[PDB]
Enzyme design. Sequence first.
Site, mmCIF file in Angstrom:
data_model
loop_
_atom_site.group_PDB
_atom_site.id
_atom_site.type_symbol
_atom_site.label_atom_id
_atom_site.label_comp_id
_atom_site.label_asym_id
_atom_site.label_seq_id
_atom_site.Cartn_x
_atom_site.Cartn_y
_atom_site.Cartn_z
ATOM 1 C CG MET A 287 -1.889 1.225 1.281
ATOM 2 S SD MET A 287 -2.900 1.486 -0.199
ATOM 3 C CE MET A 287 -3.016 3.274 -0.167
ATOM 4 C CD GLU A 322 2.903 -0.501 -3.991
ATOM 5 O OE1 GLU A 322 2.818 -1.573 -4.633
ATOM 6 O OE2 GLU A 322 1.946 0.306 -3.852
#
Length: 902
Positions: A287, A322
Site C-alpha cells: 500500500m 508503490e
Amino acid sequence: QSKPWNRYRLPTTLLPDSYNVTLRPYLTPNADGLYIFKGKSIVRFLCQEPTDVIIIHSKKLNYTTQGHMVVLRGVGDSQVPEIDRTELVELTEYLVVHLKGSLQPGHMYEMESEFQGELADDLAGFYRSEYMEGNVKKVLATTQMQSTDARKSFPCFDEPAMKATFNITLIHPNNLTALSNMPPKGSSTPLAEDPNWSVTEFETTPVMSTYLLAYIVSEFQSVNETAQNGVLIRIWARPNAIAEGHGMYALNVTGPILNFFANHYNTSYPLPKSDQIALPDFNAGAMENWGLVTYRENALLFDPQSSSISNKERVVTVIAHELAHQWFGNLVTLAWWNDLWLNEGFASYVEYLGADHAEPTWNLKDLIVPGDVYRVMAVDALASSHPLTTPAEEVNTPAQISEMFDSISYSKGASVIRMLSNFLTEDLFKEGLASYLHAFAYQNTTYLDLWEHLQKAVDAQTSIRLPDTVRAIMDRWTLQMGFPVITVDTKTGNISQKHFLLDSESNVTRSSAFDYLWIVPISSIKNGVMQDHYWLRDVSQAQNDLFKTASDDWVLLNVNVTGYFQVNYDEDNWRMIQHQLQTNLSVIPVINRAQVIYDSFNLATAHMVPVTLALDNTLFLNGEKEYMPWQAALSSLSYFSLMFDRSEVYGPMKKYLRKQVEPLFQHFETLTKNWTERPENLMDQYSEINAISTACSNGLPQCENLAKTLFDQWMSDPENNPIHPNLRSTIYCNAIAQGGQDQWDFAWGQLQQAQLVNEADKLRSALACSNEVWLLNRYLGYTLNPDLIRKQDATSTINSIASNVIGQPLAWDFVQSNWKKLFQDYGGGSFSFSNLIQGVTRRFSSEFELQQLEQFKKNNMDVGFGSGTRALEQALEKTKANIKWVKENKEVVLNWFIEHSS
Ligand SMILES: *[C@@H]1O[C@H](CO)[C@@H](O[C@@H]2O[C@H](CO)[C@@H](O[C@@H]3O[C@H](CO)[C@@H](O)[C@H](O)[C@H]3NC(C)=O)[C@H](O)[C@H]2NC(C)=O)[C@H](O)[C@H]1NC(C)=O
Ligand SMILES: *[C@@H]1O[C@H](CO)[C@@H](O[C@@H]2O[C@H](CO)[C@@H](O[C@@H]3O[C@H](CO)[C@@H](O)[C@H](O)[C@H]3NC(C)=O)[C@H](O)[C@H]2NC(C)=O)[C@H](O)[C@H]1NC(C)=O
Ligand SMILES: *[C@@H]1O[C@H](CO)[C@@H](O[C@@H]2O[C@H](CO)[C@@H](O[C@@H]3O[C@H](CO)[C@@H](O)[C@H](O)[C@H]3NC(C)=O)[C@H](O)[C@H]2NC(C)=O)[C@H](O)[C@H]1NC(C)=O
Ligand SMILES: *[C@@H]1O[C@H](CO)[C@@H](O[C@@H]2O[C@H](CO)[C@@H](O)[C@H](O)[C@H]2NC(C)=O)[C@H](O)[C@H]1NC(C)=O
Ligand SMILES: *[C@@H]1O[C@H](CO)[C@@H](O[C@@H]2O[C@H](CO)[C@@H](O)[C@H](O)[C@H]2NC(C)=O)[C@H](O)[C@H]1NC(C)=O
Ligand SMILES: *[C@@H]1O[C@H](CO)[C@@H](O[C@@H]2O[C@H](CO)[C@@H](O)[C@H](O)[C@H]2NC(C)=O)[C@H](O)[C@H]1NC(C)=O
Ligand SMILES: *[C@@H]1O[C@H](CO)[C@@H](O[C@@H]2O[C@H](CO)[C@@H](O)[C@H](O)[C@H]2NC(C)=O)[C@H](O)[C@H]1NC(C)=O
Ligand SMILES: *[C@@H]1O[C@H](CO)[C@@H](O[C@@H]2O[C@H](CO)[C@@H](O)[C@H](O)[C@H]2NC(C)=O)[C@H](O)[C@H]1NC(C)=O
Ligand SMILES: *[C@@H]1O[C@H](CO)[C@@H](O[C@@H]2O[C@H](CO)[C@@H](O)[C@H](O)[C@H]2NC(C)=O)[C@H](O)[C@H]1NC(C)=O
Ligand SMILES: *[C@@H]1O[C@H](CO)[C@@H](O)[C@H](O)[C@H]1NC(C)=O
Ligand SMILES: *[C@@H]1O[C@H](CO)[C@@H](O)[C@H](O)[C@H]1NC(C)=O
Ligand SMILES: [Zn+2]
C-alpha cells in the site's frame, strides 16, 4: 427530499483545512483479550455554503468526548452555533452534528473529539498485527486506510478529493519506534501521566488524502541510505530480518527508482524521506501510503541464499509500483474511486519502467505482455467483462468502491496506458504527464484532465499526427469493454476488426455507444523490416497495401504487442511466418514470437483458426532459446495437459514436448557449465527455469538424472543445499516423484524446520509430487493438522496433491468426505472453499465426472458451501465447457501430437 446523512456521498458545504490526530494503541489486551486504541482529534474546516449540520465519516468508534460526541469552536473570532445533538448513522458511516443555527460561508471552525476503537487483527484502519520472535509472540500497531478505513481510526471527511494537512502524534511504549508519513519533529518525550509511554510528534504532512495516511508502532529496525539530495531512505523490518541482511536488495533499488521517477515525472520527490516497511502476513500485499509504504515481507525482503530470481523481480517491480504512486496518485489524486483504473493502471505500467532503471540488463519492460496484457485479455474477452470507466454516480458504497480494484482496472489500465504512450511516443507522453502533474499538484483530477494535457503536448508539435483527438481515441478503449481481433487478408491487404470473444457462441448484452468498434494503432513488420505506422479508423473493414503481401513475403502486425488487440491472418501468411520462425527466428522480435503463440491459441478457442494451426506455431520452439515464446507455449498448453494427462493423448504430447525441449536443455547444460553457474540476465535465467521444468515434467531422462543426482547429494549433506534457488521447485518435485518415503521423509523434515516461507512453500508443493498413493493419502491426512500444516496453507496443499494426476482421485475423495468441515472453518478461518473447489474439479471433462459433481452438490441439506457457494456452480458450468471442448478436440489433437512427436 432525502436527509443528507442517508446519502453515501458527503455534502460539499464543508471542506477540511487541517487535522490534529493523536493515536494511542494499547498493545496489551484488557484480560478479556480485547485490544484497543484511544485517540483525540481536532479538524479545522471551512464553511462554503450555509448549513446547520456537520456530516463527517466515523466507523466503529466510541466517543468519550466531554458533553456531546464533539466540541465545536469557531476559529479566530468566528461565533459558533450551539450543538443540538450528535448521532452516529452506521449505514453511511457518519457522525452527524445537528446544530441550533447555521455555519457561515467563509468562516472556519474547529471540531474536537475523543474516541476509542478496537485494535482488531482485521487489517483495516488502525489495527494490530501478531507475529513470533523466538518464544515470544509480538504485537505491533499499523494502518490500512485504503479505501474507506481512515474513518475507522479517527473522524474525518474521508473522500480522496477532500485533501488536508495532518499533524500526527503517536503515544506508544517508550521502547518502541513510531513511524508516520512524515519525519518525527524530534526526540520522543515521556507521557506525563505514565512515563512508560512516550509521545512522538510528526511534521505536518503536505495537503493530502486520508486514504494515504499511515502510522506504525513496532520493534522494527532499519537499513538506511541518504540520497545526494538529502532524502533519507529506510527499509524497515523485524530485527531478525534486518540482521540477516534481507532488507539490502530493497535498499539497493530504492534510490535509483526514486531518481528515475523524479526525472520521468519532471518533478522532485515531494517528501523529505522515504520509509518502506515489511510486515509479516500483510494480506493487502502493498500500500502506497505517502512516505511510509507498507509491504508484505515476501514482497519487500530478499534472501540471496534461498530466494530465486523471480523473487528478485517481484521485489524490484512491487517497489517501483508503490514508488510510482508517490507522484501519480498521491501528489495528484483522482477525485473519485470510479477513476481508480487510471491510478492503478498507470502504476501497473510504469512499475516496469522504474524497475528497468534499477535493473537495466533485465529487459523488464517486456514482462508487461505476459504479466498484464495476455493475463487481462483472458477476462476481457468475455461477455461478462466491463469498461474501464464507470459513471461516478454508480460508485457510492464502500463495497462498490472495493469492486473497482480488479484485473481490468490494474492490467487493462496498464495495457491501454502503455498503448497510449507508445502511439504518442514516450517523449510526448512524458511532456503531457509533467504538464498534468505541475497543474494539479496537491489537488484532484479525472482521467479527462490527463487526456487534455496530453492533447496540449500533441497540439504543441507537428511530428506525431493522430486520426482524432486523444480523448476520442481513448474513449474507444475506456468507455466500452473488451478489445478487437484484427484480421488481415494478405492477398488483398484487407483488414478488419470485430469484438473478440473466446466463446464464439456467447451473446453480448452490454451495449456500446460505439457498436464495439475501435480506433486502433497498428504497427507492422514486413520481412523483418519495420513499416510505416497505420491507424484503423472506426470502420469494420478497410484496405491498405502495408498489409498486402507477395507469395514469398510475410507481414506481422502489432510489434511488441504495444496495441491492446490480437491478430489473425490468412493461412498462407501464417505458414510464411511459421517458415520464417523455422529457418531464422532472429528476424521476428522475441515478443512477437510469443504473440504468434498466444494469439493463435486464443483464436483456436474462438474457432477463428483450427487448433492444429496454433499447435503448428509451437513447431519452431526446438530452436528457441528465449524465455517468452516458450512461456507462451507452456501457458497455452497447460489446459491441454489438464484435459489430456489421463488420456491416450498424453503419451504423444509428452513425447512431442520432450522433442521440443531437449535441445534447449542441451543448450543450458553447456552454457551453465554442467549446471554450475546460472545464465547472466533475468530472461535467460527464466528460460533455464522453464526448460528444466518442461524437460523433467515430460520425462526427459537427462533431466530426471540431474534431479536425482542433486537431491541425493543434498540428502547426503542436509546443511549444505546444493540446489540453486531458481531450480529448487523442479528438482525437489522430480526427485520426490522418482523416489519413495526416504526422499519424502527427508523433505518433510526440511519443511518442518524451514525458517523461510518461500522455501517452505517449495517443499509443501514438491511433497505433492510423490507417485505413491499411500504417501499422498498420508499427506492429505496432514493438511487438516495445524501442528503440521498451517491453516492458511491447507487448501493450497490439497490443491497441490490434486494437481498430481495420481493425487486427483485422492484429493477429490478427501474433499467430498471431509466437506463436513465447513461448520468448523467459516467463522474460525475463512479457508476459501472457492479455491479448493476450483482446484480439485479443474480436470473434470467427462459426463461421468459431471454426474459426480452433481451428486456431491446433493448435500444441499444444511452444511452449505459457505464462501464457495456458487463457486460450485462455476465448476459445474466449467465441466460442461470442458466436456464440449474435449469432444471437439480429442481426435485432432491426438493425431497432431502423434504426427509431430517423431
Ligand atoms: C494542533 O497541534 C499543534 C501542536 O501541538 C498545536 O500548536 C501548539 O499549541 C501549543 C499551545 O496549545 C503551543 O505550545 C505552547 O503553549 C504555551 C501555552 O502556555 C505557550 O506559552 C507557548 O507559546 C507554546 N510553546 C512554544 C514553544 O511556543 C505550541 O507552540 C503550538 N505548536 C506549534 C504552533 O507548532 C495546535 O494548537 C493544535 N491545533 C488546534 C486547533 O488545537
Ligand atoms: C464500544 O462500546 C460498545 C457498546 O457499549 C462496546 O461493546 C460492548 O462491550 C460490552 C462489554 O465489553 C459487552 O457487554 C457485556 O459485558 C459484560 C461485562 O464485560 C460481559 O459479561 C458480557 O459478556 C458482555 N455481553 C455479551 C453479549 O458478550 C457487549 O457485548 C458489547 N456491545 C456491543 C458489541 O454492542 C465496546 O467494547 C466498545 N469498544 C471500545 C473499543 O471501547
Ligand atoms: C546490493 O548492492 C551491492 C553493491 O552493488 C551488492 O554487493 C555485491 O554482492 C556480490 C555478491 O555477494 C559480490 O560479488 C561477489 O561475491 C563473491 C562471493 O563472496 C566474491 O567471491 C566476489 O569477489 C564478488 N565479486 C565478483 C564476483 O565480481 C560483490 O562483491 C558485491 N559488490 C560490492 C560493491 O560490495 C549486493 O549484492 C546487493 N544486494 C543484493 C541483495 O542484491
Ligand atoms: C498543524 O501544524 C501546522 C504547523 O505548525 C499548523 O500550521 C499553522 O497554522 C496556524 C493556524 O492556522 C498558522 O498561524 C501558521 O501559519 C501555520 N504554520 C505553518 C508552518 O503552516 C496547522 O494549523 C496545524 N493544524 C491544526 C489543525 O492545528
Ligand atoms: C519493551 O518493553 C516490554 C516490557 O518490558 C518488553 O516486553 C516483554 O518482553 C519479554 C521478552 O524479553 C517478555 O518475556 C514479556 O512477556 C514482555 N512483557 C510485556 C508486558 O509485553 C519488550 O521485550 C521490550 N522490547 C524491546 C524491543 O526492548
Ligand atoms: C523538467 O524539464 C525541464 C524542461 O526540459 C528542465 O529544464 C531544462 O533543463 C535542461 C538541462 O540543462 C536545459 O538545457 C533546458 O534549457 C531546461 N529547459 C527549461 C525550459 O528550463 C528541468 O530541469 C526539469 N525539472 C525537473 C524538476 O525535473
Ligand atoms: C479538486 O481539484 C480541483 C482542481 O482540479 C480544485 O479546484 C481548484 O482549486 C484551486 C485551489 O483552490 C484553484 O486555484 C483552482 O482555480 C480550482 N480549479 C477548478 C475549480 O477547476 C478543487 O478545489 C479540489 N477539490 C477539493 C475539495 O479540494
Ligand atoms: C476486400 O475489400 C474489397 C473492397 O472493399 C472487396 O471487394 C468488394 O466486394 C463486394 C462483394 O459483393 C463487391 O460488391 C464490391 O464491388 C467489391 N469492391 C471492389 C472490388 O472494389 C473484397 O471482396 C475484399 N476481399 C476479401 C475480404 O478477401
Ligand atoms: C521491441 O522490443 C524490443 C525488446 O524486447 C526492443 O529492443 C530493445 O530496444 C532498446 C532501444 O532500441 C535497446 O536499448 C534494447 O537493448 C533492445 N533490446 C533487445 C533485446 O533488442 C525493440 O526496440 C522493440 N521494437 C520496437 C519497434 O519498438
Ligand atoms: C445466445 O443466443 C442464441 C440465439 O441468438 C441462442 O441460440 C443461445 O442459446 C444463446 N446463448 C448462448 C450461451 O449461446
Ligand atoms: C538471421 O537473421 C539475423 C538477424 O537479422 C542475422 O543477423 C543473421 O545473419 C541471419 N542468420 C542466418 C544464418 O541466416
Ligand atoms: Zn498501486
